[PDB]
Structure formats: C-alpha cells, structure tokens
Amino acid sequence: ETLCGAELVDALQFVCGDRGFYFNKPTGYGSSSPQTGIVDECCFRSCDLRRLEMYCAPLKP
C-alpha cells in the first residue's frame, strides 16, 4: 500500500513535473540534525498525495 524505490521516483516525477523533487525534508538552522524525508513518510509508511507533493522543489519563476 506504499511507495518505494522506483515507484516512489515515478510518483514524484509525475506529481512534481517540471519543478523536480528532493528526498530530505528541510530542517531549521541550528536545529536538530538523523535525517528523515519521504522514504520514512511514504515508503516505510503510507502517505497521501498532499504529503508527497511537499517534496516537490519550489516553482520556478
């Protein structure tokens, strides 16, 4: 019921399109720093579309 490896990249490619995507969720400066991201959210666990789309890079212009 989840998305891993190749299936996850295909999903991010389709949802993010031109914008591209990243895997590690941003953290705050001088924050805590073991890193978590989409694998944890969507592969080890199931996530919904609105979580997944938070890993799209910003819109260009």
Q: Which long-range contacts (CB under 8 A, 24 or more apart) does 40-44 make?
A: 42/2, 42/3, 42/8, 42/11, 43/2, 43/3, 43/4, 43/5, 43/8, 44/2
Give me Rg for the CA atoms of the chain.
12
Domain span holding position 6 = 1-61
Give the CATH number, domain containing residue 23. 1.10.100.10
16 is written with which tokens? 């993010």
- Domain total for the chain? 1
- Cα Dmax for the chain: 36
Burial of 31 (0-12, 13-18, 19+ CB in 10 A): exposed
